[PDB]
Amino acid sequence: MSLLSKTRELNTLLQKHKGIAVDFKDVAQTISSVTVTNVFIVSRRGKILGSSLNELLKSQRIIQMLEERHIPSEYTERLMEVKQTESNIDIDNVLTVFPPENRELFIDSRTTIFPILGGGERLGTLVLGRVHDDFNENDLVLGEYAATVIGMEILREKHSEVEKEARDKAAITMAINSLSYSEKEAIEHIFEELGGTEGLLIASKVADRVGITRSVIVNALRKLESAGVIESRSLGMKGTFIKVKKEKFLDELEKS
Protein backbone atom coordinates (compact mmCIF):
# COMPACT_ATOMS: atom_id res chain seq x y z
CA MET A 1 0.00 0.00 0.00
CA SER A 2 1.47 3.31 -1.16
CA LEU A 3 1.69 6.63 0.66
CA LEU A 4 -1.19 8.08 -1.37
CA SER A 5 -3.40 5.05 -0.69
CA LYS A 6 -2.74 5.28 3.06
CA THR A 7 -3.60 8.99 2.92
CA ARG A 8 -6.95 8.25 1.27
CA GLU A 9 -7.82 5.70 3.95
CA LEU A 10 -7.08 8.15 6.77
CA ASN A 11 -8.91 11.04 5.10
CA THR A 12 -12.00 8.91 4.48
CA LEU A 13 -12.09 7.06 7.82
CA LEU A 14 -10.96 9.76 10.27
CA GLN A 15 -13.13 12.57 8.86
CA LYS A 16 -15.58 13.92 11.43
CA HIS A 17 -19.16 13.33 10.24
CA LYS A 18 -22.19 15.04 11.73
CA GLY A 19 -24.19 12.72 13.98
CA ILE A 20 -21.18 10.69 15.19
CA ALA A 21 -19.40 10.91 18.54
CA VAL A 22 -15.65 10.32 18.39
CA ASP A 23 -14.68 6.83 19.58
CA PHE A 24 -10.97 6.82 20.39
CA LYS A 25 -10.88 3.01 20.45
CA ASP A 26 -11.97 2.94 16.81
CA VAL A 27 -9.60 5.76 15.87
CA ALA A 28 -6.67 3.74 17.23
CA GLN A 29 -7.71 0.66 15.24
CA THR A 30 -7.86 2.68 12.01
CA ILE A 31 -4.41 4.16 12.62
CA SER A 32 -2.99 0.79 13.67
CA SER A 33 -4.31 -0.94 10.56
CA VAL A 34 -3.41 1.80 8.07
CA THR A 35 0.13 2.41 9.33
CA VAL A 36 0.82 -1.14 10.58
CA THR A 37 1.71 -0.18 14.15
CA ASN A 38 0.70 -0.46 17.78
CA VAL A 39 -1.17 2.73 18.65
CA PHE A 40 -1.71 4.44 22.01
CA ILE A 41 -3.71 7.67 22.32
CA VAL A 42 -2.91 9.35 25.65
CA SER A 43 -4.57 12.38 27.21
CA ARG A 44 -2.45 15.19 28.62
CA ARG A 45 -3.01 13.67 32.08
CA GLY A 46 -1.98 10.16 31.02
CA LYS A 47 -5.29 8.39 30.48
CA ILE A 48 -5.38 5.80 27.70
CA LEU A 49 -8.22 7.17 25.57
CA GLY A 50 -7.69 4.44 22.98
CA SER A 51 -5.33 1.68 21.89
CA SER A 52 -4.96 -1.03 19.27
CA LEU A 53 -2.16 -3.53 18.66
CA ASN A 54 -0.89 -4.73 15.30
CA GLU A 55 -2.20 -8.29 15.70
CA LEU A 56 -0.72 -9.27 12.30
CA LEU A 57 2.59 -10.31 13.88
CA LYS A 58 3.99 -13.76 13.23
CA SER A 59 5.13 -14.39 16.80
CA GLN A 60 2.29 -15.44 19.08
CA ARG A 61 4.69 -14.92 21.99
CA ILE A 62 5.06 -11.23 21.13
CA ILE A 63 1.31 -10.81 20.54
CA GLN A 64 0.42 -12.40 23.89
CA MET A 65 2.95 -10.29 25.80
CA LEU A 66 1.58 -7.09 24.24
CA GLU A 67 -1.99 -8.18 24.96
CA GLU A 68 -1.10 -8.91 28.60
CA ARG A 69 0.78 -5.70 29.35
CA HIS A 70 -0.97 -2.62 30.72
CA ILE A 71 0.93 0.57 29.89
CA PRO A 72 2.04 1.87 33.33
CA SER A 73 0.87 5.27 34.52
CA GLU A 74 4.50 6.09 35.31
CA TYR A 75 5.18 5.94 31.56
CA THR A 76 2.10 7.79 30.29
CA GLU A 77 2.75 10.64 32.73
CA ARG A 78 6.31 10.95 31.41
CA LEU A 79 4.94 11.55 27.89
CA MET A 80 3.76 15.06 28.82
CA GLU A 81 7.45 15.96 29.19
CA VAL A 82 8.12 15.01 25.55
CA LYS A 83 7.58 18.37 23.86
CA GLN A 84 8.46 17.54 20.23
CA THR A 85 8.19 14.51 17.97
CA GLU A 86 10.67 11.78 18.94
CA SER A 87 10.93 9.05 16.32
CA ASN A 88 12.58 5.62 16.18
CA ILE A 89 13.17 5.32 19.91
CA ASP A 90 14.98 2.08 20.76
CA ILE A 91 14.21 -0.46 23.48
CA ASP A 92 16.87 0.76 25.93
CA ASN A 93 15.29 4.25 25.94
CA VAL A 94 13.06 5.13 28.87
CA LEU A 95 10.55 6.46 26.32
CA THR A 96 10.09 3.02 24.72
CA VAL A 97 6.46 1.91 24.85
CA PHE A 98 7.37 -1.81 24.72
CA PRO A 99 7.77 -4.14 27.73
CA PRO A 100 11.15 -3.76 29.46
CA GLU A 101 11.70 -7.37 30.52
CA ASN A 102 12.11 -9.38 27.30
CA ARG A 103 14.70 -7.17 25.64
CA GLU A 104 15.52 -9.88 23.08
CA LEU A 105 12.04 -10.11 21.58
CA PHE A 106 11.85 -6.29 21.31
CA ILE A 107 15.54 -5.62 20.61
CA ASP A 108 14.65 -4.17 17.19
CA SER A 109 11.54 -2.27 18.31
CA ARG A 110 11.03 1.40 17.47
CA THR A 111 8.79 3.82 19.35
CA THR A 112 7.69 7.19 17.95
CA ILE A 113 5.98 9.87 20.03
CA PHE A 114 3.88 12.73 18.63
CA PRO A 115 2.77 15.61 20.89
CA ILE A 116 -0.89 16.43 20.24
CA LEU A 117 -1.20 20.22 20.19
CA GLY A 118 -4.32 22.35 19.99
CA GLY A 119 -4.96 26.02 20.61
CA GLY A 120 -1.50 26.59 22.03
CA GLU A 121 -1.91 23.91 24.70
CA ARG A 122 -0.87 20.28 25.05
CA LEU A 123 -3.89 18.05 24.54
CA GLY A 124 -2.28 14.62 24.78
CA THR A 125 0.20 12.31 23.11
CA LEU A 126 0.15 9.85 20.22
CA VAL A 127 2.49 6.88 20.65
CA LEU A 128 3.28 4.42 17.85
CA GLY A 129 5.34 1.27 18.14
CA ARG A 130 6.80 -1.34 15.79
CA VAL A 131 8.43 -4.57 16.90
CA HIS A 132 10.88 -5.06 14.01
CA ASP A 133 10.81 -2.05 11.65
CA ASP A 134 11.77 1.62 11.43
CA PHE A 135 9.59 4.70 11.00
CA ASN A 136 10.50 6.25 7.64
CA GLU A 137 9.58 9.75 6.48
CA ASN A 138 6.29 8.57 4.97
CA ASP A 139 5.37 6.90 8.27
CA LEU A 140 6.10 10.09 10.21
CA VAL A 141 3.91 12.12 7.85
CA LEU A 142 1.01 9.76 8.49
CA GLY A 143 1.68 9.85 12.23
CA GLU A 144 1.68 13.65 12.32
CA TYR A 145 -1.59 13.80 10.41
CA ALA A 146 -3.21 11.33 12.80
CA ALA A 147 -1.99 13.40 15.74
CA THR A 148 -3.41 16.55 14.14
CA VAL A 149 -6.82 14.93 13.65
CA ILE A 150 -6.99 13.59 17.21
CA GLY A 151 -6.06 17.00 18.59
CA MET A 152 -8.96 18.62 16.75
CA GLU A 153 -11.40 16.09 18.23
CA ILE A 154 -10.02 16.47 21.75
CA LEU A 155 -10.17 20.25 21.38
CA ARG A 156 -13.86 20.12 20.46
CA GLU A 157 -14.49 17.67 23.31
CA LYS A 158 -12.72 19.78 25.93
CA HIS A 159 -14.36 23.03 24.76
CA SER A 160 -17.87 21.63 25.25
CA GLU A 161 -16.91 19.94 28.53
CA VAL A 162 -15.56 23.11 30.14
CA GLU A 163 -18.62 25.07 29.02
CA LYS A 164 -21.00 22.43 30.37
CA GLU A 165 -19.28 22.14 33.75
CA ALA A 166 -19.29 25.93 34.09
CA ARG A 167 -22.98 26.09 33.16
CA ASP A 168 -23.73 23.44 35.79
CA LYS A 169 -21.66 25.11 38.51
CA ALA A 170 -23.33 28.47 37.84
CA ALA A 171 -26.78 26.87 37.98
CA ILE A 172 -26.06 25.12 41.29
CA THR A 173 -24.68 28.28 42.89
CA MET A 174 -27.65 30.32 41.69
CA ALA A 175 -30.11 27.66 42.85
CA ILE A 176 -28.52 27.44 46.30
CA ASN A 177 -28.39 31.22 46.67
CA SER A 178 -32.05 31.65 45.71
CA LEU A 179 -33.18 29.23 48.45
CA SER A 180 -34.44 30.51 51.79
CA TYR A 181 -33.38 28.83 55.02
CA SER A 182 -36.64 26.87 55.33
CA GLU A 183 -36.71 26.02 51.61
CA LYS A 184 -33.18 24.61 51.86
CA GLU A 185 -34.22 22.40 54.78
CA ALA A 186 -37.23 21.14 52.81
CA ILE A 187 -35.09 20.10 49.82
CA GLU A 188 -32.84 18.11 52.17
CA HIS A 189 -35.90 16.29 53.51
CA ILE A 190 -37.42 15.82 50.04
CA PHE A 191 -34.39 13.88 48.78
CA GLU A 192 -34.14 12.09 52.12
CA GLU A 193 -37.59 10.64 51.38
CA LEU A 194 -36.95 10.00 47.69
CA GLY A 195 -33.86 8.02 48.71
CA GLY A 196 -31.94 9.29 45.71
CA THR A 197 -31.84 11.93 43.00
CA GLU A 198 -34.98 10.71 41.18
CA GLY A 199 -38.38 9.45 42.23
CA LEU A 200 -42.04 10.13 42.88
CA LEU A 201 -42.87 12.72 45.54
CA ILE A 202 -46.26 12.97 47.24
CA ALA A 203 -45.75 16.49 48.58
CA SER A 204 -48.85 16.68 50.79
CA LYS A 205 -48.06 13.33 52.43
CA VAL A 206 -44.34 14.08 52.75
CA ALA A 207 -45.03 17.56 54.14
CA ASP A 208 -47.23 16.00 56.81
CA ARG A 209 -44.61 13.46 57.89
CA VAL A 210 -41.78 16.02 58.16
CA GLY A 211 -43.78 18.75 59.88
CA ILE A 212 -43.40 21.14 56.95
CA THR A 213 -46.10 22.84 54.93
CA ARG A 214 -46.87 21.79 51.37
CA SER A 215 -46.35 25.40 50.28
CA VAL A 216 -42.70 25.40 51.36
CA ILE A 217 -42.03 22.17 49.45
CA VAL A 218 -43.72 23.56 46.33
CA ASN A 219 -41.82 26.85 46.40
CA ALA A 220 -38.45 25.17 46.98
CA LEU A 221 -38.88 22.86 43.99
CA ARG A 222 -40.09 25.83 41.94
CA LYS A 223 -36.79 27.61 42.59
CA LEU A 224 -34.75 24.54 41.66
CA GLU A 225 -36.82 24.20 38.48
CA SER A 226 -36.34 27.88 37.64
CA ALA A 227 -32.58 27.47 38.04
CA GLY A 228 -32.54 24.37 35.83
CA VAL A 229 -31.23 22.13 38.61
CA ILE A 230 -34.17 19.68 38.47
CA GLU A 231 -37.12 18.88 36.26
CA SER A 232 -40.63 18.59 37.71
CA ARG A 233 -43.87 17.13 36.37
CA SER A 234 -47.21 16.60 38.09
CA LEU A 235 -48.54 13.07 37.58
CA GLY A 236 -52.22 13.75 38.34
CA MET A 237 -54.26 15.25 41.14
CA LYS A 238 -51.43 14.13 43.43
CA GLY A 239 -47.76 13.37 43.02
CA THR A 240 -44.81 15.03 41.33
CA PHE A 241 -41.91 13.44 39.46
CA ILE A 242 -38.54 14.87 40.50
CA LYS A 243 -35.18 14.42 38.77
CA VAL A 244 -31.95 16.22 39.61
CA LYS A 245 -30.19 17.38 36.44
CA LYS A 246 -27.05 18.76 38.18
CA GLU A 247 -25.32 15.73 39.69
CA LYS A 248 -23.12 17.70 42.09
CA PHE A 249 -26.05 19.78 43.37
CA LEU A 250 -26.76 17.87 46.58
CA ASP A 251 -23.06 17.69 47.50
CA GLU A 252 -22.80 21.46 47.02
CA LEU A 253 -26.06 22.02 48.92
CA GLU A 254 -24.85 20.38 52.14
CA LYS A 255 -21.75 22.59 51.90
CA SER A 256 -24.06 25.63 51.92
Author numbering: 1 to 256
What's written in the study?
Unexpectedly however, the structures revealed a previously undescribed monomeric form of SaCodY and a dimeric EfCodY. Nevertheless, ligand-free SaCodY can also form dimers, as confirmed with SEC-MALS. This suggests that a monomer–dimer equilibrium may be a factor in regulation of SaCodY activity. The asymmetric unit of the ligand-free SaCodY crystals contains two well-structured monomers with their GAF and DBD domains tightly packed head-to-tail. Therefore, it is possible that the dimer observed in the SEC-MALS experiments of ligand-free SaCodY is the non-biological head-to-tail dimer observed in the crystals. To determine if the DBD domain of ligand-free SaCodY is flexible in solution, we used hydrogen deuterium exchange mass spectrometry, which did show the DBD domain to be flexible. In more detail, in absence of ligands, Arg69 in the H3–H4 linker, extends its side chain into the vacant Ile binding site making a hydrogen bond to the main chain carbonyl group of Val97. In the ligand-free structure, elevated B-factors suggest that the H1-H2 loop region (residues Leu14-Phe24) has increased flexibility. Superimposition of monomeric ligand-free and dimeric-activated SaGAF domains shows that residues Gln15-Lys18 in the ligand-free domain cause steric clashes with the linker helix and S3–S4 loop of protomer B. This may explain the monomeric state of ligand-free SaCodY.
